[PDB]
Motif scaffolding. Structure first.
Motif, short mmCIF file in Angstrom:
data_model
loop_
_atom_site.label_atom_id
_atom_site.label_comp_id
_atom_site.label_asym_id
_atom_site.label_seq_id
_atom_site.Cartn_x
_atom_site.Cartn_y
_atom_site.Cartn_z
N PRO B 11 0.79 -1.23 0.00
CA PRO B 11 0.00 0.00 0.00
C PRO B 11 0.82 1.28 0.00
O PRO B 11 0.22 2.36 0.06
CB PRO B 11 -0.82 -0.14 1.29
CG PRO B 11 0.00 -1.04 2.19
CD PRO B 11 1.13 -1.62 1.37
N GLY B 14 3.91 3.71 -5.15
CA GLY B 14 3.12 4.71 -5.83
C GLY B 14 2.38 4.18 -7.04
O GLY B 14 2.63 4.63 -8.16
N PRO C 5 1.89 -2.31 9.13
CA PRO C 5 1.68 -1.07 8.38
C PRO C 5 0.32 -0.48 8.67
O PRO C 5 -0.60 -1.19 9.11
CB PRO C 5 1.81 -1.52 6.92
CG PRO C 5 1.41 -2.94 6.94
CD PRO C 5 1.93 -3.48 8.24
N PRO C 6 0.14 0.83 8.45
CA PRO C 6 -1.20 1.42 8.56
C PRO C 6 -2.15 0.87 7.51
O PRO C 6 -1.75 0.45 6.43
CB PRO C 6 -0.94 2.92 8.35
CG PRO C 6 0.47 3.11 8.70
CD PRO C 6 1.18 1.85 8.29
N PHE C 8 -3.89 1.57 4.88
CA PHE C 8 -3.95 2.53 3.79
C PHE C 8 -4.37 1.82 2.52
O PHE C 8 -3.94 0.70 2.25
CB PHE C 8 -2.60 3.21 3.59
CG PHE C 8 -2.65 4.39 2.68
CD1 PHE C 8 -3.67 5.32 2.78
CD2 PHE C 8 -1.67 4.58 1.73
CE1 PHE C 8 -3.71 6.41 1.94
CE2 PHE C 8 -1.70 5.66 0.89
CZ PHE C 8 -2.73 6.58 0.99
N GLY C 9 -5.22 2.47 1.74
CA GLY C 9 -5.71 1.82 0.54
C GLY C 9 -4.78 1.86 -0.65
O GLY C 9 -5.14 1.34 -1.71
N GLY C 10 -3.60 2.45 -0.51
CA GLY C 10 -2.71 2.63 -1.63
C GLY C 10 -2.95 3.93 -2.36
O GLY C 10 -4.04 4.51 -2.32
N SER C 11 -1.92 4.40 -3.05
CA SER C 11 -1.98 5.69 -3.72
C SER C 11 -0.90 5.72 -4.80
O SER C 11 0.02 4.91 -4.80
CB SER C 11 -1.78 6.84 -2.74
OG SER C 11 -0.41 7.01 -2.43
N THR C 12 -1.04 6.67 -5.72
CA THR C 12 0.02 6.90 -6.69
C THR C 12 1.12 7.76 -6.11
O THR C 12 2.27 7.67 -6.55
CB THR C 12 -0.53 7.55 -7.95
OG1 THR C 12 -0.92 8.89 -7.65
CG2 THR C 12 -1.71 6.78 -8.48
N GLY C 13 0.80 8.61 -5.14
CA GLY C 13 1.83 9.31 -4.40
C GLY C 13 2.51 8.34 -3.46
O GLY C 13 1.86 7.74 -2.59
N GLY C 14 3.81 8.16 -3.62
CA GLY C 14 4.50 7.23 -2.76
C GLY C 14 5.89 6.87 -3.23
O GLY C 14 6.67 7.73 -3.65
N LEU C 15 6.20 5.58 -3.19
CA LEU C 15 7.56 5.11 -3.42
C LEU C 15 7.76 4.85 -4.90
O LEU C 15 7.11 3.97 -5.48
CB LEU C 15 7.82 3.84 -2.60
CG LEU C 15 8.33 3.98 -1.17
CD1 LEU C 15 7.33 4.67 -0.29
CD2 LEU C 15 8.57 2.60 -0.63
N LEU C 16 8.65 5.61 -5.51
CA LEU C 16 9.05 5.40 -6.89
C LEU C 16 10.24 4.44 -6.91
O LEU C 16 10.52 3.77 -5.92
CB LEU C 16 9.32 6.74 -7.56
CG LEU C 16 8.07 7.61 -7.72
CD1 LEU C 16 8.38 8.93 -8.39
CD2 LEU C 16 7.01 6.85 -8.50
N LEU C 53 4.48 1.09 11.02
CA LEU C 53 5.67 1.18 10.19
C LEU C 53 5.28 1.71 8.82
O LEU C 53 4.71 0.98 8.00
CB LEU C 53 6.36 -0.17 10.05
CG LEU C 53 7.60 -0.15 9.17
CD1 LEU C 53 8.74 0.54 9.88
CD2 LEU C 53 7.99 -1.57 8.79
N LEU C 54 5.60 2.97 8.56
CA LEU C 54 5.25 3.65 7.32
C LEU C 54 6.51 3.91 6.51
O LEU C 54 7.41 4.61 6.98
CB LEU C 54 4.51 4.95 7.63
CG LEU C 54 3.85 5.68 6.46
CD1 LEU C 54 3.09 4.71 5.64
CD2 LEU C 54 2.91 6.71 6.97
N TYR C 55 6.56 3.37 5.31
CA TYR C 55 7.70 3.54 4.41
C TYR C 55 7.43 4.73 3.50
O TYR C 55 6.40 4.78 2.83
CB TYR C 55 7.92 2.29 3.57
CG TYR C 55 8.62 1.17 4.29
CD1 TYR C 55 9.93 1.30 4.70
CD2 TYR C 55 7.96 -0.02 4.54
CE1 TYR C 55 10.57 0.27 5.35
CE2 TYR C 55 8.59 -1.05 5.19
CZ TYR C 55 9.89 -0.90 5.59
OH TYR C 55 10.53 -1.93 6.24
#
Ligand code: CLA
Ligand code: CLA
Ligand code: CLA
Ligand code: CLA
Ligand code: CLA
Ligand code: CLA
Ligand code: CLA
Ligand SMILES: CCCCCCCCCCCCCCCC(=O)OC[C@H](COP(=O)(O)OC[C@@H](O)CO)OC(=O)CCCCCCCCCCCCCCC
Ligand SMILES: CC1=C(/C=C/C(C)=C/C=C/C(C)=C/C=C/C=C(C)/C=C/C=C(C)/C=C/C2=C(C)CCCC2(C)C)C(C)(C)CCC1
Ligand SMILES: CC1=C(/C=C/C(C)=C/C=C/C(C)=C/C=C/C=C(C)/C=C/C=C(C)/C=C/C2=C(C)CCCC2(C)C)C(C)(C)CCC1
Ligand SMILES: CC1=C(C/C=C(\C)CCC[C@H](C)CCC[C@H](C)CCCC(C)C)C(=O)c2ccccc2C1=O
Ligand code: SF4
Ligand code: SF4
Ligand SMILES: [Ca+2]
Lengths: 733, 153, 138, 30, 79, 80, 37
Positions: B11, B14, C5-6, C8-16, C53-55
């Protein structure tokens, strides 16, 4: 390894048997892994939705190719002269000769002449332009789309029905009897009175003037007040011309009961009144079974209360036997559908209901033969699923002493009596045919056993055919049946008597001594096919040769060379043999129908009436005489339009004899032959590189019985379709 | 009944697992293109990628070009397509020379200097072959029309 | 790096692809109460009971998250640790590098980055000509 | 007769039963 | 100028019937039927579960539906 | 593999265990007959399905049954 | 094979596709499928 994912036992053998058996087992949903009854029923339901969409896409394609590539605009000018074009030929193989030969029925492209009769059906139900067919085709594309979406929807877990929904027989019977058989018949009567009858009388009733133009000058207030006679005020006069207004009549519901004197078919008002009556009866028959409310019947009460002394348990515990078994339900459905497909075939040729389809002879022959072959297939499938029910879903404990238990408790008696009647009837039909044949060949045709079929002639006399001299019920106008003394309500009788006594139509054909013997041959074929089918159905649970066949299943190959040899003992092999007998019987009856109607259409009925009583008459006046126009479809001089039919004739012979290969030669020969070929591949240079993943084996025993049956069937049908369609189109348009 | 999950159960990456990006059809189709198909050597996937683009690049100059209103209509399109495939392969090999100079592993055979060189070679062969085969069908268009309709059969 | 992990539903903003080629940052905090916070990547998530634990891909995102953990919650979450984890595997420990937050004097830290003058006594670039240095760092 | 663009309209309409048949058959395969 | 009918017993009959159908739709559809202003003889309406709101709502929708039926059927002709 | 089942009606006549080509069957001691032996099918993953064991069984109906099932390399007799 | 009807180029392109592309693609995909794993 992955392909037959429904069965893990097939994803293990490293042979080609898993490919063949994956294709075959793919629809037997009862044998898949992880299958419960609920998942069975839901997968079945969505398969039905997919198949409804197949039917709608098929009729959409038929409509779209009549509209796009067909001459429907031209054909509805003079349907007697122009041949209806099915679709367009486009293959790059055609030479100049074939392109000029297949340019026909007033086209520029090479075209195929339609023998399905969809042109007559579209013309009768009021479709008179290519845009109407295009709108119908796009509408059926959307309807097929809707049913595909419905199937996908009912595979979703939220919308998957429960088992109690599928096992609800009473509500389904209510909604099918009333809402599917009655409301659709009512809606068809509505289309007939609004669109087909008015456009048969001339005026355009499209979707625009649908609401503005009432079907009758009187409104619906006469329908409500009970004064229903205004809808039968002035019927279509006997000088009415289809598609235009000369003596129209403006009566939407009449019951003349004869034939239209110009289209030779039934009156569309008579059809509409028929569907109105059928809709009324089917709607009240759909209010018979109990549902969420209080009134109605419970089928368990009806069945369990029918117990007599001569059966004992009667029908007790037949509701759960039929409801829990899907092969019983499928057998009953296929039996009734085969009976009514036979009925469709036997009534659409004697009582045609489409404009000018009784004057286009090739399409009438194609439709009769098509529906009789479908009816034979469906009847054989009904008995096949009777056998599958007796193997799989039959519980002899719950079905204790009821009618099914007493079917199996005396199966030897009725199998031996079917044996006697088929032997008796076959011995004497072949005896009379060989006697007539030998005494005709010996120069003395006066010595033939010619038997007047007096019983069927008497049946025709009871229906009004006064040719034979009986005056019994309707041939005697003084009788109680013809007058109908209490009411004289025989409104149909003058038209019916005028139609049955005219020598033109196929309604109640003249029956002579040549028809007696072929009816007994047809009875022989029906009895022997029934004998094989019930000998597979009742011996599906085991005979003395193998008292356990329920544990080996339906379609096991054999049981070894022990016990004397046990080659075709499974009930599937009785399906196999009765498939041969079905194809034979339908060949006999379609040969008979075809020759009888080639006599009737040409007017030279004497040919059948004197030459059908012996076998070389059947052989030289029918098979040899009528294939003259066929095999000359391409000769060294040139090619005419019956060239694809000559090619299909030879093609069907080739498929038939390949079927002989699969049926006569058996698996051991081919397995050791393939072993030599495998050695050849594995030991040759430059082809050692290419290796099989699935080891080549010969086709299985039951698999190649099925493949030979499929070849026999396909070649048999293709040969006869080519012959029947080129013999009539050779001499009738 | 949610159809948009996170990508591959993670989750915080990106990416969303939308019905276009991460469907079963997309996995089976994008994952079976030559750039992603399993087990292929780089030369054959470059060859299959190349032909799909050489056959493509013929058309735009053939129907819309400075020579589209002359007798050398197809030759101008072929010349333009060879120019584009030449600069495409020069760009591909320059990308290989640039990106794959620091030593990397062999988890994917395409993302390495030998693998990208094989991919560029296959792309060149396939691109020029596809361009010339589309030129050969277009130049001999009367023949293809006649054989698909049956003027010579 | 313990912690669920929290939600969270996932997003495009995040880990590239920066996260799995070079460093990415993990923020670990412990809260008793389940509640909702704004991820700096965009959206809203669910603080799990106990450890989280948030990456994240930038240090500024981790410190922005820790800032809103401190100031936007009435039961202030101040036991948050920010790590820098490498794809090779080793985990660094970054933001509460000493025991206490940087605003408070730990009295055991070292004064680095401190010049012994004000800006007026900064040397001028004409004196350090062609020296490879610049007027602050002399 | 019939129009040129009615045939292509029928094709793009029948592209919808194609998609729904593909998705129904895929869902039956589960 | 679409066709229309002036007034008759037929116009009165159909709009009362559409008001009856609107009564049925309102009773089977409205979530809060009894809530609102107090009403005289509420047993006559739906046994103390129906208000002055849904009096005017249901038969007002009946007048809308009946205007639709009257104008549509008089334009189509059959009324 | 095919499953070879031996029922109570076995008379211990040994005919099945020597009619078997692949020698899937073997005789084990038993207390239910005069011969004091019953056939067993230990190595039944080697059964090809030839049913020479059923052919040799004298008891009626059958004291040994072969139930053809999931084919393998051993149970299809492929040298390749 | 001239086409008098509307869109005569449409059989010109759809007989090769249904005759070759549909069989070659369908048998190719089924050959990958029945022999996978
Ligand atoms: C009024 C409501 C209604 C309606 C219209 C239907 C309609 C249908 N149901 Mg359904 N169903 C109902 C309620 C209803 N059902 C209820 C309430 C239950 C739950 C208890 C079910 C449970 C049920 C199941 C479990 C199944 C069906 C199935 C079907 C289909 C069967 C009919 C068919 O395919 O052939 C169409 C048949 C006709 C139109 C009539 C039959 C033809 C007769 C014999 C006349 C012969 C034709 C005539 C001679 C001339 C025609 C020729 C002309 C065409 C040229 C059909 C779409 C099956 C299906 O297809 O699922 C998708 C299915 O498996 N339904
Ligand atoms: C309403 C129609 C209908 C329904 C739904 C069923 C459904 C069933 N039948 Mg069938 N059956 C029917 C009509 C019907 N049948 C008719 C009319 C016949 C007589 C020809 C039979 C004769 C029959 C036999 C003898 C057998 C079944 C069996 C089966 C089951 C598995 C299907 C299968 O293996 O096919 C999977 C598909 C194939 C094998 C492909 C071959 C079919 C032809 C040659 C290809 C046509 C494809 C072409 C593109 C169109 C399934 C329950 C079998 C079974 O095990 O029952 C439990 C079985 O042994 N059927
Ligand atoms: C010319 C071909 C031919 C002939 C005459 C027969 C004859 C017969 N078949 Mg048939 N059958 C055939 C082809 C033929 N079949 C084929 C190709 C198959 C497909 C595999 C079958 C499959 C088959 C099945 C599976 C069954 C029969 C049965 C029988 C009997 C049917 C009873 C009957 O018709 O009265 C007898 C009529 C005859 C014409 C008998 C021929 C003897 C003539 C008159 C000369 C005898 C005098 C002397 C011995 C010489 C009869 C012996 C059924 C049966 O035995 O029921 C009791 C049975 O169950 N048939
Ligand atoms: C005299 C030596 C010489 C000659 C005959 C060529 C010949 C060629 N090279 Mg080149 N090459 C050379 C030296 C040379 N190379 C040098 C020193 C470099 C290292 C930087 C390259 C790197 C290079 C790349 C990366 C690629 C080529 C490829 C090509 C082919 C056509 C494109 C081209 O460069 O136009 C003809 C060029 C000349 C006549 C002048 C050559 C001298 C310069 C330095 C070439 C630089 C190439 C440039 C980076 C990209 C090509 C430009 C082109 C598309 C217009 C052709 C066979 C391309 C190809 O098709 O390979 C499959 C390819 O992808 N070359
Ligand atoms: C069901 C019975 C009935 C009957 C027979 C009619 C019949 C008609 N109504 Mg009517 N109507 C009905 C009940 C009925 N209505 C009800 C209950 C209501 C109340 C909500 C309405 C509200 C209504 C209005 C508001 C209007 C009509 C209009 C129409 C006319 C053409 C409608 C049309 O084809 O739209 C065209 C169909 C399309 C698909 C086009 C879509 C257009 C939008 C903007 C997109 C036609 C006389 C129209 C009129 O006055 O025509 C003279 C009009 O504007 N009716
Ligand atoms: C199942 C019904 C049915 C059948 C038997 C056929 C049969 C045929 N069609 Mg098709 N067609 C149909 C449906 C049908 N069609 C529908 C619904 C459409 C409307 C979009 C068309 C549109 C159409 C075009 C535009 C063309 C044909 C053509 C052809 C011919 C060659 C096959 C081909 O090129 O495929 C092409 C097929 C398609 C483009 C779509 C077919 C999709 C169907 C519905 C699949 C059915 C699945 C099946 C039941 C399982 C052949 C006569 C060609 C022709 O006449 O050449 C002389 C041609 O040019 N068809
Ligand atoms: C049902 C489909 C069908 C169709 C449309 C064809 C059509 C054709 N056949 Mg064939 N045939 C078929 C089925 C079919 N056949 C079957 C089932 C049999 C077995 C009984 C045969 C047996 C047969 C033989 C034995 C021969 C033909 C030949 C011919 C061709 C005659 C003209 C010619 O020289 O073509 C030339 C060939 C082609 C047009 C093939 C297409 C290749 C070109 C290069 C197009 C490819 C373009 C490009 C490279 C790729 C584009 C990719 C795309 C995505 C854009 C003609 C195209 C004759 C022939 O010449 O065959 C080569 C001939 O000798 N056929
Ligand atoms: C002439 C053309 C058609 C011939 C078809 C040939 C069928 C063969 C006839 C053999 C006689 C069958 C013996 C009936 C078997 C039997 O004993 O049934 C006896 C049966 C009376 O049964 P009960 O009413 O006791 O049964 C209770 C429930 O089973 C049904 O009520 O009466 C019949 O004769 C009805 C059968 C007519 C339908 C046949
Ligand atoms: C499911 C199943 C099954 C079944 C199947 C089959 C067996 C079928 C067949 C059946 C059939 C297929 C039947 C038929 C029927 C018949 C009938 C039903 C007849 C009668 C008719 C009527 C009665 C009519 C009469 C008349 C006349 C003739 C004239 C006019 C008048 C009248 C109308 C009266 C079995 C058991 C195997 C098993 C289990 C499962
Ligand atoms: C399907 C599909 C799709 C796609 C589209 C398209 C339309 C495609 C394209 C396609 C293409 C675009 C194709 C192409 C092909 C190609 C080819 C097939 C080529 C061939 C080549 C060759 C023939 C070459 C060879 C050679 C020569 C000739 C000489 C020189 C050299 C060489 C050797 C190389 C999509 C994505 C939408 C998705 C859905 C489905
Ligand atoms: C010819 C023959 C073979 C040999 C058949 C083999 C080896 C397979 C035949 C298929 C070959 C590969 C040709 C297939 C071409 C057909 C058009 C089938 C197409 C595939 C289907 C899915 C439609 C047997 O194995 C056999 C077994 C038992 C009784 C009779 C026979 C028998 O007669
Ligand atoms: S010949 Fe074939 S079917 Fe007959 S017993 Fe032997 S193995 Fe069985
Ligand atoms: S052949 Fe039959 S009776 Fe004899 S030992 Fe074997 S199983 Fe027993
Ligand atoms: Ca120019």
């Amino acid at each position: 390894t992955k392909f037959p994912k429904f069965s893990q036992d097939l994803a293990q053998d490293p042979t080609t048997r898993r490919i063949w058996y994956g294709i075959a087992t793919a629809h037997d949903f009862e044998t898949h892994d992880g299958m419960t009854e609920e998942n069975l029923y839901q997968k079945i339901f969505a398969s039905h939705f997919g198949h409804i969409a197949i039917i709608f896409l098929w009729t959409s394609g038929t409509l779209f190719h009549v509209a796009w590539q067909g001459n429907f605009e031209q054909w509805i000018k003079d349907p007697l002269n122009i041949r209806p074009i099915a679709h367009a030929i486009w293959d790059p193989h055609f030479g100049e000769g074939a392109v000029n030969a297949f340019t026909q029925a007033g086209a520029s492209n090479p075209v195929n002449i339609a023998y399905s009769g969809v042109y007559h059906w579209f013309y009768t139900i009021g479709m008179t332009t290519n845009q109407e067919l295009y709108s119908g085709a796009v509408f059926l594309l959307v309807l097929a789309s809707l049913f595909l979406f419905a199937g996908w929807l009912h595979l979703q877990p939220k919308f998957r029905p429960s088992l109690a929904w599928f096992k609800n027989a009473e509500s389904r019977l209510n909604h099918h009897l009333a809402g599917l058989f009655g409301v659709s018949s009512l809606a068809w009567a509505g289309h007939l009175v609004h669109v087909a009858i008015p456009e048969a009388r001339g005026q355009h009733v499209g979707w625009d003037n649908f609401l503005s133009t009432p079907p009758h000058p009187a409104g619906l207030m006469p329908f409500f007040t009970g004064n229903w006679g205004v809808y039968a005020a002035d019927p279509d006069t006997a000088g009415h011309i289809f598609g235009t207004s000369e003596g129209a009549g403006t009566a939407i519901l009449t019951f003349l009961g004869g034939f239209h004197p110009q289209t030779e078919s039934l009156w569309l008002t008579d059809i509409a009144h028929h569907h109105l009556a059928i809709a009324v009866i089917f709607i009240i028959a759909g209010h018979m079974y109990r549902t969420n409310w209080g009134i109605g019947h419970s089928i368990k009460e009806i069945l369990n209360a029918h117990k007599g002394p001569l059966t004992g348990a009667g029908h007790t515990n037949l509701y759960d036997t039929i409801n829990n078994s899907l092969h019983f339900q499928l057998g009953l459905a296929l039996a009734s559908l085969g009976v009514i497909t036979s009925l469709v075939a036997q009534h659409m040729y004697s009582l045609p209901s489409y404009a000018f389809i009784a004057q286009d002879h090739t399409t009438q022959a194609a439709l009769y033969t098509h529906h009789q072959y479908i009816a034979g297939f469906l009847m054989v499938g009904a008995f096949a699923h009777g056998a599958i029910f007796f193997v799989r879903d039959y519980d002899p404990v719950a079905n204790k002493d009821n009618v099914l238990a007493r079917m199996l408790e005396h199966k030897e008696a009725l199998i031996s009596h079917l044996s006697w009647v088929s032997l008796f009837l076959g011995f004497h039909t072949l005896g009379l045919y060989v006697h007539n044949d030998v005494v005709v060949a010996f120069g003395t045709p006066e010595k033939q056993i010619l038997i007047e079929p007096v019983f069927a002639q008497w049946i025709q006399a009871t229906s009004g055919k006064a040719l034979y001299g009986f005056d019994v019920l309707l041939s005697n106008p003084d009788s109680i049946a013809s007058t109908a003394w209490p009411n004289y309500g025989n409104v149909w009788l003058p038209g019916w008597l005028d139609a049955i006594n005219s020598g033109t139509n196929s309604l109640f054909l003249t029956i002579g001594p040549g028809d007696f013997l072929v009816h007994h041959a047809i009875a022989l074929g029906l009895h022997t096919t029934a004998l094989i089918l019930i000998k597979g159905a009742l011996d599906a649970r085991g005979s003395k040769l193998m008292p356990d066949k329920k544990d080996f299943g339906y379609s096991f190959p054999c049981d070894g060379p022990g016990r004397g040899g046990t080659c075709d003992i499974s009930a599937w092999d009785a399906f196999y043999l009765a498939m041969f007998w079905m194809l034979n019987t339908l060949g006999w009856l379609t040969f008979y129908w075809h020759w009888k109607h080639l006599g009737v259409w040409s007017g030279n009925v004497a040919q059948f009436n004197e030459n059908s009583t012996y076998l070389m008459g059947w052989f030289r006046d029918y098979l040899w005489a009528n294939s003259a126009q066929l095999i000359n479809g391409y000769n060294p001089y040139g090619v005419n339009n019956l060239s694809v039919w000559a090619w299909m004739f030879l093609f069907g012979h080739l498929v038939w004899a390949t079927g002989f290969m699969f049926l006569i030669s058996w698996r051991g020969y081919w397995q050791e032959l393939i072993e030599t070929i495998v050695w050849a591949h594995e030991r040759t240079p430059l082809a050692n590189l290419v290796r099989w993943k699935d080891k080549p084996v010969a086709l299985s025993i039951v698999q190649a019985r099925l493949v030979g049956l499929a070849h026999f069937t396909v070649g048999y049908v293709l040969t006869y379709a080519a012959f029947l369609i080129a013999s009539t189109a050779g001499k009738f348009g | 009944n949610q159809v948009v999950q996170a990508y591959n159960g993670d989750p915080f990456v990106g990416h969303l697992s939308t019905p276009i990006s991460d469907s079963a059809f997309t996995r089976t189709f994008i994952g079976n293109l030559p750039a992603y198909r399993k087990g292929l050597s780089p030369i054959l996937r470059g060859l299959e990628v190349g032909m799909a683009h050489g056959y493509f690049l013929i058309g735009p100059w053939t129907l819309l070009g400075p020579l589209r209103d002359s007798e050398y209509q197809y030759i101008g399109g072929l010349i333009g397509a060879l120019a584009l495939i030449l600069v495409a392969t020069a760009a591909l090999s320059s990308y290989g020379l640039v990106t794959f100079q620091g030593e990397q592993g062999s988890g994917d055979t395409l993302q390495t200097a030998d693998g990208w060189s094989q991919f560029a070679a296959g792309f060149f062969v396939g691109g020029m072959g596809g361009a010339f085969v589309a030129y050969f069908l277009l130049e001999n268009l009367s023949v293809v029309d006649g054989i698909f309709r049956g003027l010579f059969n | 790096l313990s912690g669920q992990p929290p939600k969270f539903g996932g997003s495009t903003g995040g880990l590239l692809s920066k996260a799995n080629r070079e460093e990415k940052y993990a923020i670990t905090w412990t809260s008793a109460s389940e509640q909702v916070f704004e991820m700096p990547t965009g959206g809203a998530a669910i603080m799990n009971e106990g450890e989280n634990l948030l990456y994240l891909a930038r240090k500024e995102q981790c410190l922005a998250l820790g800032t809103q953990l401190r100031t936007k919650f009435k039961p202030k979450i101040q036991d948050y640790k920010i790590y820098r984890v490498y794809p090779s595997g080793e985990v660094q420990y970054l933001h509460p590098a000493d025991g206490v937050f940087p605003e408070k004097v730990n009295e055991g830290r070292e004064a680095q980055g401190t010049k012994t003058r004000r800006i007026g006594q900064n040397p001028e670039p004409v004196t350090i000509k062609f020296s490879g240095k610049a007027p602050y760092e002399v | 007769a019939l129009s040129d663009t009615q045939i292509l309209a029928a094709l793009v309409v029948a592209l919808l039963p194609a998609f729904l048949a593909f998705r129904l058959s895929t869902e039956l395969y589960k | 100028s679409p066709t229309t009918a002036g007034w008759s017993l037929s116009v009165g009959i159909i709009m009362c019937l559409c008001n009856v159908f609107a009564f049925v739709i309102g009773y089977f559809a409205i979530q809060k039927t009894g809530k609102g202003k107090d009403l005289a003889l509420p047993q006559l309406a739906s046994k103390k579960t129906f208000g002055l709101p849904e009096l005017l709502a249901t038969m007002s929708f009946g007048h809308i539906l009946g205007a639709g039926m009257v104008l549509g059927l008089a334009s189509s002709g059959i009324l | 593999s095919h499953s070879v089942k031996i029922y109570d009606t076995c008379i211990g006549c040994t005919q099945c265990v020597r009619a078997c080509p692949l020698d899937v069957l073997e005789m084990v001691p038993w207390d239910g007959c005069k011969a004091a032996q019953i056939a067993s099918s230990p190595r039944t993953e080697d059964c090809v399905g030839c049913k020479r064991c059923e052919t040799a069984c004298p008891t009626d109906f059958l004291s040994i049954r072969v139930y053809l099932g999931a084919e393998t390399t051993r149970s299809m007799g492929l040298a390749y | 094979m001239d086409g008098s009807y509307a869109a005569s180029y449409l059989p010109w392109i759809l007989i090769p596709m249904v005759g070759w592309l549909f069989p070659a693609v369908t048998m190719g995909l089924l050959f990958i499928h029945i022999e996978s794993e």
